[PDB]
């Protein structure tokens, strides 16, 4: 029910991998927002309600690059 | 105290480059910065909500970070790692 901030570390992403990761994440049902974040600009950050994170990661792994791992989950306050 | 130990090893939050974050539409902005260190070397930084908690990967471990109303961080973190919180400027 509450929006979650999900941060996924991309392992050694090209610029192209970052863009492709944002687009695929944005198209997932429940995702309201996407960004690239982190000191190394290697994180896909997703905000969504009731997002299957395991399936977002699995999608990034088959379609974008081998290395994608959840590194942060924070429930949004209202 | 964990900030004094960090200060001894050359860490100063007021001189840390800002986290690379966005304010997302449709959710409140995060009012805290956090800075994450392994053997006192900054590995990453991010934002979080005061008076709350979040789960994150520190080294090989999934851990809960507790954030009090002043952005002070607490939780069980792996040996050699350090996480420090501060108010995001303006909040």
Author numbering:
A (entry chain A): 2 to 79
B (entry chain I): 23 to 113
Extract from the study:
We crystallized complexes of APikL2F with sHMA94 and APikL2A with sHMA25 following co-expression in E. coli for comparative structural analysis. The APikL2F/sHMA94 and APikL2A/sHMA25 complexes display the three binding interfaces previously reported for AVR-Pik/HMA complexes. Consequently, we could only measure binding affinity of APikL2F to sHMA94 with a calculated Kd of 145.8 nM. However, we observed that the presence of Asn-66 in APikL2F results in an altered local hydrogen bonding network around Gln-44 in sHMA94, when compared to Asp-66 in the APikL2A/sHMA25 complex. As a result, the side chain of Gln-44 of sHMA94 is rotated relative to Gln-43 of sHMA25, allowing Gln-44 to form additional intramolecular hydrogen bonds with Thr-38 in sHMA94. The altered hydrogen bonding network around Gln-44 in the APikL2F/sHMA94 complex, compared to APikL2A/sHMA25, appears to firmly lock Gln-44 in place compared to Gln-43 of sHMA25. Our data indicates that this hydrogen bonding network stabilizes the interaction between APikL2F and sHMA94, providing an explanation for the binding specificity observed in the yeast two-hybrid and in vitro binding affinity assays.
Here, we unravelled the biochemical and structural basis of adaptive evolution of APikL2, an exceptionally conserved paralog of the well-studied rice-lineage specific effector AVR-Pik. Whereas AVR-Pik and other members of the six-gene AVR-Pik family show specific patterns of presence/absence polymorphisms between grass-specific lineages of M. oryzae, APikL2 stands out by being ubiquitously present in all blast fungus lineages from 13 different host species. Using biochemical, biophysical and structural biology methods, we show that a single aspartate to asparagine polymorphism expands the binding spectrum of APikL2 to host proteins of the heavy-metal associated (HMA) domain family. The structures were solved and refined as described in the Materials and Methods. In each case, the APikL2 variants and HMAs form 1:1 complexes, with both displaying the same global fold and interaction interfaces as previously described for the interaction of AVR-Pik with the Pik-1 integrated HMA domains.
